[PDB]
Structure 1
Amino acid sequence: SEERREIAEVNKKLKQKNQQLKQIMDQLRNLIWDINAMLAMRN
């Protein structure tokens, strides 16, 4: 009966963690895009 109650927190916590990873990932990819664009035409 209480299993459901306890499961929910792990789902929400995990979901929150995933959301945080999304912010880091989109930020790192923007950094790599910027360095690619700037370095491509240094010649």
Structure 2
Amino acid sequence: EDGSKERREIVEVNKKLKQKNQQLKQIMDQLRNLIWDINAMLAMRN
């Protein structure tokens, strides 16, 4: 830390990846919630 005495492309790629993760999680949420789809309905499922 101490002794008691260029990054434009990087930030651009970082923001792009962050937006990508955001839209990815947005796409996730739907199938994530609808994933079970039989759990509450095992009473008659087979």
Band the TM-score falls in, shorter-chain normalisation: 0.5 to 0.7
Relative to 1, partners in 2 of residues 1:40 and 1:23: Cα closer, same or farther, differing over 3 Å? Answer: farther
Q: What is the RMSD computed on CA atoms of the aligned residues?
A: 6.0
In the TM superposition, structure 1's runs of 4+ consecutive aligned residues that sit over 2 Å from their partners are: 33-43
**Which structure has the larger Rg?**
2
Cα displacement (A) at 1:20 = 0.5
> Could you list the per-position Cα deviations for residues 17-37 of structure 1 after superposition, in whole angstroms to 9, with x for gaps in the alignment?
000011111111111134433
What secondary structure, in the 3-state scheme, does the structure 1 residue paired with 2:20 have?
helix
RCO (CA 8 Å, sep 6+): is it higher in 1 or 2?
A: 2
Percent identical among aligned pairs is 95
Aligned length, in residue pairs: 43
Q: What is the rounded CA distance, in whole Å, between the counterparts of 2:11 and 2:5 in structure 1? A: 10
Please, what TM-score do these two structures have when normalized by structure 1? Answer: 0.66
